Design a protein around this ligand. Structure first.
Ligand SMILES: [Au+]
Length: 323
């Protein structure tokens, strides 16, 4: 294990002040420019629009163009310039630090796995919500595809079992995964029709392909808002905040390019400009950076430390999503 944060101290503790409860949604395939807040032609986020104290960040570049590449980078101390995917698995990452500091770290996954981020942590601190042995909300579509809202079912137990600790809950959603965008949302979220239902994106009508993708954003909107909504039911006991960042974006036909994963060298901006949202309770004292701050995945690790009153030298100079 290669540490970078052995100096990390937590300056105030949950026995001498309100314990902190944060949800970090790790998003999937979402594009900054199909967010309404960023100027999109469609209301892709009606519910987030209704919630007080949410910051939309109009300028976020992802560490890379794939799940296996950006998710480790998202939790790394090295930053996108010194980051190396291939040894990432055995660096100390920010969840290692907070867990060492006694913050209770949970990872629920309706996507794949943590792409190595949870590896040094006890198996039990990770749960597979793609399967119905965990996800109560799989039966809501003709595909039986388990849903991200399911990852909220039961979080109250756990908060029960961790009563009086600091908690960082990572929800790794299926989000906007392709090719089969149409499969990602329940019929309630089918605002835009007709829709691509083919596996050969390209042979589809661009508009129909745009349409499935935006329906899949509406569901993500419903998940994120339900995520804040669950936090709110704990605001008088815990300092609650919610961080959402996508791992990468998506090419939807631009220059005959689709899906993602193109090497950062020659990658279209579509695969790298990602949305980021931050919500907090007014009682917490947290303050967001300006909406328009030019930010990258490198802001996540310092945000996570600041959320828990934890300083660490390798990122004391790093711009976070919050002051
Ligand atoms: Au991804």
């Amino acid at each position: 294990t290669i540490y970078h944060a052995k100096d990390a101290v937590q300056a105030t503790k949950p026995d001498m002040r309100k314990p902190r409860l944060v949800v970090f949604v790790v998003g999937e395939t979402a594009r900054a420019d199909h967010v309404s807040f960023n100027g999109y032609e469609r209301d892709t986020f009606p519910q987030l629009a209704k919630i007080d104290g949410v910051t939309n960040f109009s300028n976020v570049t992802s560490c890379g163009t794939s799940t296996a590449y950006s998710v480790p980078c998202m939790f790394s101390y090295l930053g996108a310039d010194e980051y190396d995917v291939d040894t990432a698995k055995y660096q100390e990452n920010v969840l290692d630090t907070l867990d060492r500091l006694g913050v209770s770290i949970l990872w629920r996954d309706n996507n794949s796995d943590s792409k190595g981020v949870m590896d040094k942590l006890p198996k039990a601190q990770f749960a597979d919500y793609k399967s119905a042995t965990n996800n109560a909300i799989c039966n809501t579509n003709p595909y039986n595809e388990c849903r991200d809202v399911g990852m909220l079912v039961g979080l109250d137990d756990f908060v029960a079992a961790n009563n009086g600790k600091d908690m960082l809950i990572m929800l790794h959603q299926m989000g906007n995964h392709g090719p089969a965008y149409f499969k990602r949302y329940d019929e309630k979220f089918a605002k835009f029709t007709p829709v691509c239902e083919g596996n050969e994106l390209a042979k589809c009508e661009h508009q129909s392909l745009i349409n499935a993708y935006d329906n899949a954003l509406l569901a993500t909107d419903d998940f994120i808002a339900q995520s804040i909504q669950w936090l709110q039911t704990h605001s008088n006991a815990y300092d609650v905040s919610m961080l959402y960042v996508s791992d990468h974006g998506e090419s939807l036909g631009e220059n005959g390019v689709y899906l993602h994963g193109m090497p950062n060298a020659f990658a279209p901006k579509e695969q790298r400009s990602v949305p980021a949202f931050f919500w907090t309770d007014k009682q917490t004292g947290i303050t967001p950076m300006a909406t328009d701050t030019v930010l990258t995945h490198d802001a996540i690790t310092p945000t996570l430390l600041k959320l828990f009153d934890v300083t660490a030298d390798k990122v004391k100079d790093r711009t976070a999503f919050i002051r």
